[PDB]
Symmetry: C3
Subunit: 598 residues, 3 copies
């Protein structure tokens, strides 16, 4: 039987005709043509004689997957399915352009991977570096071509085999898309590793329209050797992370792991849930990464995320090289609900909703960060966590605006004394920020706003309490070493009646010509003896800066009343006109709202 | 012809060789192997002799779909397509573990359903309970195994056949995922029923990473027999509902139907549109559901939804059992635009943006709700709807914060007199909340903020009007039965000049040592006869609590001026110093801002 | 060989049996039956003898794609794949119902297109109108049937061939879904054209549940002939655009192109990124489009978008026909970060975050726009861009509310003098709006809030600066031609000490009985000679409207103090009581906060 021989051969399907639903108007095809409309790893997972090899822990699937990608790339692209119901193990490094990236598989343009099954790293990779999927085509990324139109999706899994790092200097990654344009990962679970990143998008600003959506990242740090981790690093513009889940269980992750980093303009991190990490997101312009999309990171969005972290939620920064200065501006952080998970004070990096972070060498004077809006977020830290702040302002800041947040933590504004001395401009804390009471009674010796800066200019701090905290030393304190000019500092009187210090200016900075301030204080006054309208004067001469003051106290007396309002005198006394129904020197201790130019 | 017999047999495709695109480097396969890469209901929808059965209203497809799921489960999973262009009817109950859940189909781990066609319930199910897809494997959920990695997706439809409930005690569901980990429904339309739920995720905190996305839910309540309905019930952590559409047309739905419920930590409801429902979302910690994820519901997010409802948008609650106390905290409700649809006053449950709801037995003293942020929402109710409030505060509340919302309805804060007497702590209504004017002139006999509580502590109400409503009895009223301490209550003067009552304290609660208050009032004053600086005193003695007051009125006179500011006296009179250019007793009725400790 | 002849025929696959994975419990099928579970363009892309035709620039694929759609429609629907690895060119118009829409392909209900390859317009379409995919079935949309359940998705591309418009009156579109119910486009890149729209949803309110998700729109305007462009036009309710990318590079786009328009109730535009466009979104109710969903556009959401534009971000409007009045209400604009891209002043349409736009004939008195909430957005325009405003209020407005935004541009509120004279009601600018300083020192001769209106009622403007701008003429100015009543206008004193004009009322409008105002001013005062309590009077008589004033200045003198507070007198002088320790006439120039009814 000649026909038998043909039909049973690999050419057989090319001899069996087919026409869609027996439609006389349809194309006369061969079965092979229709089968050729799809492709899977099974079509390349064979020995040199063409016999299928079953996958398993004792088989290295790398060369077969690479053969599939290379072939489909040759025919103008398509989608290769990694079949469900099997685990496909990888057990060797790739060659050529990806060798410079410890690469296993080389991605190619217009070739998508539909991962429905599981991909698992074999013990070959224990204690070694690896980047599982690499879209660079040269070991030097500067000399690499682009990866375009490459999408990885499905219900499958990338499993890093649990192996610890061999050395802190090693790098490990899941997907490095490279100089990547229109690439994405959707639906995939990345799990069980000790890695630097799960996914990186772009290279130093080269790339566009790269997205990570509906992915899970689970337990991707597990050792003390791991130097640092960010799950997704976004290093091209017009790119981002949406609707993902990030979880860690290791103690190490609570000290080293961040969920996302946004490093180029028009990038976003939205609608995701994070548990067990140190940090939520870095939002930065590194001068060293400015080649592809310029030296400005603008239009940066962190919105509608949910997080339990141990360190800082959003870290802002920018820095310089010999030839480039990085700028960060036009940032929005909104709709996020974030807490510091239960932990001892000082047992992880300092807790913060916003951190203004010094550069990688510790420099606090290279930053150009401005036009940042932080609005409609909620932040909570347990009462014991001394090291918790709405903002840790540790490096130069050229602007940040807080409106309509709920912050419930130890400090509102903080920087550690005897560390950096930031120059602060255009810091706005609107009165609409609600200050919670979880840390009430825990603030002995502490200043709610602790202004440990070199200087503050064109700034607004409108303090509004919503309950007592009579433990705090002050609502806001400026050390004598902090210059203050062209600024507005106010403390609302509600819940403050029993505080000896509301606002403290240790260098008398509130006396500046262009400082606008109001806060409560207790003042002792004595009157003249005159019957009728009579002056009251303050005993102390500490009020040369006061433009007006008014009573926050009732008058318990019948035969006289102190002034409702006061001005000052050249010698620093307050003075006002009260009323003596009967004559007599009067003496009273009253709570006043002290006002300067407001 | 022996070969003929083989080829035409069910083994035939196993004798036809194939090699992808005639690539010599590809696997030598058989056609059957490639066809085996997919699977559909057609592969199991056959009689006991293997002959295909066409689906239709007179065929029960249940056993065939179950056979497909069971088989694919056996081979490590995959995705079964329910083909487009056909309606597949279900006409009997399933057996075994799902019998305890009125189950039709049993879902199995790692077996996905790609529903491209229609699934329709046959009249067998009329007046009966049913749960169409069940992931429990035991009638007792406590004894059930887990369902993992089960995804239902496609462009198809689940049609509940229109059948009314037979009895109010019956339950009906579309998908019960069970103790569910990494399960999801995407793209599916659920329609034409009278059901309890369309989808439930998790069981009493057991489960994770379950999501409902891009689904439609249309007309799923149609009878008076239906006891209660919530379209999606989220009962496992790290789970949620995103970008869905919910519509009802029945009158019954306007009284009984809610779109989503969030019952465990780290859950979300975002970006969805609701029409025709009673309620938007319950956000609750039931102690009885605390087994799998603990007794705290935290990190609860309701954001960027669009709704026309007839009752309450978000209902908050928590409750207790003999052995567990439920807590609800760290909630954010933001970016939502919501209205009460046109209806008569009191014709549906009381309209509210936020409701603090008593437990299922009516208890108002079992709740532990705090750290809730409601910000950047818009709420509207038509002018006739008396029963509309920004918040109906009906049970104990340990904290809720309102910032930067626009509320345009009858009441801002309300609880019905002669009902519950909530203990309220840490209620914050920031001045940035804009109060609309749709209900201006409709508020005769009514208090905008009607503080019908047992007690209020550590609370802030900053009332700002944006137009007149001279019909209202008061801006805020505290009955004598409401204790008030350590709180800030302010009424801005804008649009209030003609109001006889701005703030009303029926038990003189504003006199408390730690109550901080300011509001306008009209006061009559008379002066002494003295030429020059002269005292003015109030006729009435109702101001022992006032620390300062200032004029909100012009002075129409030429020969004297009343005081700009006043303090008080021990007998409760106000006193201030004005000026008599000419001597004479003066008498004036002036509008004052009365201030206490602010 | 008879069998040979059969097997090699188009009936051959119908003679090769198959049974899934050799399962004895599975259906005995033929290979043809399984192949029939999918369908692609290859099944119809053949000559009249059934021989396949390869696609290419010299082949018109139109009739073959139409044949596929028509056939699948006949069998109750399904999904047709447009295969990857090929470009499929379109080179002629379609016939019948779509001819009235310059249609190429007619979409049919329940027939989806999985576009994995590229679709490209041939030069036939140069200088001509075209709508590539049309879901109308009649040239007159009023007589058209509905398109239902039609989804276009995949990783492919629709390429418009780069051809310029032939005439401004022509229309070009990518997908017109028609009277469209449950239709969507997901994942597709639309590029390289000169078109009116890429996608339109619905027709004059007819349609529902239509969505555009994860699409890219790149370079879709390229000529001066193009009259106007909006990328996605949403003209049915319960529909919207989510997570899309929009980019233009042409100069023309910066003057004519808008990314999205929302024209019916319950529509949304979220989570998208825009670069190179004139405008972000129109949100409008055109009376002429009111047939299918009524004359109210309500529940309109513009959230969490990222944009660099050259004109206006959100344009609001409504208008009338002979028989219908359009209303726009219940709008939310939040979470957006938007800037005007670098450009010269007046080189593109006037820059604005919100524009209240006159109708297409220029009418400013047909609008009914109200209950709009603009909250938690950030807007920036470079310092040189004179024509930049938070809101350009150019037509009648019945309400708009601004809370907790950061606006950094030339004007906050603006309308050009000598143009329209809007009637403004219920405009609310909350104090929580942060006014940036990029345009500080650029505002010579300009008013920050320039109230160029016919009238303002029931409005709130609470101006809060966050730095000096001593160049501006005033913070807020009302021309004499603007009536002002029942409104609250306040200027906070911070950073204003050196301004000669803070608030300017050119028709003395602040004197109205129901106008509530406070702002700083410098006043000269002189006292009587009396030792002791002594009156000070203003030199000028411009203060008949002032209810109280207080000092914003220190007192540099030792022997006297001026009053802390003042009232007025019938002749318009201010008067207050100070203190002369020694007798003598005193004369001082002081900075006062002037207050009226607040
Ligand atoms: C883990 C992480 O993301 N950490 C960031 C930190 O990023 C920097 O350190 C990282 C440590 O892993 C990365 O440096 C390592 O990798 C570099 C890149 O690898 C080479 O190039 C790639 C293409 C190739 O495949 C590899 O084989 C290597 O040849 C190495 O050059 C370097 O020596 C390693 O230490 C990270 O490098 C970036 O990695 C991305 C993603 O792979 C690439 O696209 C970039 O090209 C590459 N960039 C550079 C300059 O090398 C390092 O950038 C971040 O710096 C900090 C940010 O926070 C600090 O800075 C801000 C701004 O001043 C302050 O505000 C903060 O206070 C301060 O903490 O965040 C960490 O989470
Ligand atoms: C319809 C709905 O969601 N209504 C909620 C209401 O939920 C409670 O009543 C529901 C009525 O249908 C459910 O109770 C019925 O179902 C229970 C569960 O079924 C059994 O178990 C399942 C697994 C099995 O398949 C079935 O065969 C049954 O054996 C029955 O036990 C009960 O007897 C029925 O009445 C709902 O039960 C939950 O259902 C989910 C989803 O199926 C399961 O995952 C849970 O295990 C199950 N939980 C329990 C405890 O049974 C009932 O919870 C909500 O209670 C209210 C919430 O609002 C009220 O409480 C809050 C907090 O105190 C207050 O703030 C509010 O003011 C107050 O109104 O919301 C309704 O919409
Ligand atoms: C390009 C764009 O979207 N521009 C809008 C502008 O829309 C109007 O002009 C458009 C110009 O292209 C459209 O008018 C053209 O098309 C019409 C519709 O085509 C016919 O019908 C379709 C079904 C058929 O396939 C075609 O063959 C035609 O027969 C023509 O009738 C008209 O003559 C053309 O100029 C647009 O028409 C709408 O198009 C959508 C989408 O296709 C259809 O669903 C509608 O039925 C159709 N509607 C009408 C009434 O024709 C025109 O609406 C917008 O008007 C403005 C909105 O902004 C202006 O108005 C508001 C509110 O008053 C103010 O606030 C603003 O200040 C002011 O600028 O926005 C532009 O971007
Ligand atoms: Ca390297
Ligand atoms: Ca049961
Ligand atoms: Ca036409
Ligand atoms: Cl200064
Ligand atoms: Cl008290
Ligand atoms: Cl008036
Ligand atoms: K490497
Ligand atoms: K049941
Ligand atoms: K046309």
């Amino acid at each position: 039987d000649q026909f038998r021989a043909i039909i049973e051969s690999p050419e057989g399907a090319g001899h069996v005709g087919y026409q869609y639903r027996r439609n006389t108007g349809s194309t006369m095809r061969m079965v092979s043509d229709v089968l050729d409309e799809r492709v899977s790893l099974w079509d390349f997972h064979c020995d040199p004689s063409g016999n299928v090899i079953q996958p398993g822990p004792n088989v290295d699937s790398r060369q077969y997957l690479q053969a599939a990608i290379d072939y489909v790339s040759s025919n103008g692209g398509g989608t290769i399915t990694i079949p469900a119901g099997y685990t496909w193990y990888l057990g060797s490094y790739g060659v050529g352009g990806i060798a410079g990236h410890s690469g296993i598989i080389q991605l190619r343009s217009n070739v998508n991977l539909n991962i429905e099954g599981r991909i698992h790293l074999s013990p070959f990779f224990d204690l070694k570096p690896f980047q599982v999927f690499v879209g660079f085509d040269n070991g030097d990324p500067a000399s690499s071509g682009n990866l375009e139109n490459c999408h990885i999706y499905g219900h499958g899994v990338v499993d890093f085999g649990g192996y610890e790092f061999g050395a802190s200097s090693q790098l490990r990654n899941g997907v490095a898309f490279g100089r990547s344009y229109n690439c994405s990962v959707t639906g995939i679970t990345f799990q069980n590793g000790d890695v630097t990143w799960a996914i990186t998008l772009g290279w130093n600003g080269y790339g566009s329209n790269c997205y990570v959506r509906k992915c899970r990242f689970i337990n991707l740090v597990n050792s003390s050797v791991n130097a640092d981790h960010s799950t997704v690093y976004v290093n091209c513009p017009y790119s981002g992370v949406e609707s993902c889940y990030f979880s860690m269980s290791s103690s190490f992750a609570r000290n080293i792991a961040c969920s996302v980093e946004l490093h180029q303009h028009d990038t976003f991190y939205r609608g995701s849930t994070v548990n067990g990490y140190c940090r939520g997101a870095y939002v930065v312009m590194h001068a060293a990464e400015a080649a592809g999309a310029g030296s400005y990171a603008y239009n940066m969005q962190v919105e509608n995320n949910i997080a339990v972290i141990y360190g800082q939620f959003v870290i802002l920064g920018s820095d310089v090289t010999a030839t480039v200065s990085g700028h960060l501006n036009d940032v929005i952080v909104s709709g996020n609900i974030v807490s510091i998970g239960e932990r001892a004070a000082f047992s992880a990096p300092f807790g913060a909703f916003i951190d203004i972070g010094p550069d990688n060498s510790g420099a606090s004077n290279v930053q150009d960060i401005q036009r940042v809006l932080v609005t409609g977020n909620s932040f909570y830290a347990p009462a014991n966590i001394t090291d918790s702040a709405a903002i840790t302002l540790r490096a130069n800041l050229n602007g940040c605006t807080f409106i309509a947040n709920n912050f419930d933590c130890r400090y509102m504004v903080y920087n550690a004394p005897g560390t950096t001395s930031p120059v602060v401009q255009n810091l706005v804390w609107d009165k609409s920020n609600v200050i919670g009471g979880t840390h009430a009674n825990q603030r002995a010796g502490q200043n709610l706003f602790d202004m440990q800066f070199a200087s503050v200019v064109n700034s607004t701090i409108e303090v509004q309490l919503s309950c007592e905290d009579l433990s705090m030393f002050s609502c806001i304190l400026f050390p004598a070493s902090c210059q203050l000019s062209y600024s507005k500092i106010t403390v609302d009187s509600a819940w403050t009646k029993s505080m000896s210090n509301t606002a403290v200016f240790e260098g008398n900075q509130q006396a500046g010509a262009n400082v606008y301030v109001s806060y409560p204080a207790t003042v002792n006054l004595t009157s003249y003896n005159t019957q009728g309208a009579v002056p009251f004067f303050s005993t102390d001469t500490n009020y040369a800066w006061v433009t007006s003051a008014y009573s926050l106290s009732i008058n318990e007396n019948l035969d006289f009343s102190p002034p409702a309002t006061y001005t000052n005198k050249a010698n620093g006394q307050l003075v006002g006109v009260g009323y003596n129904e009967i004559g007599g020197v009067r003496s009273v201790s009253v709570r006043l709202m002290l006002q300067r130019q407001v």
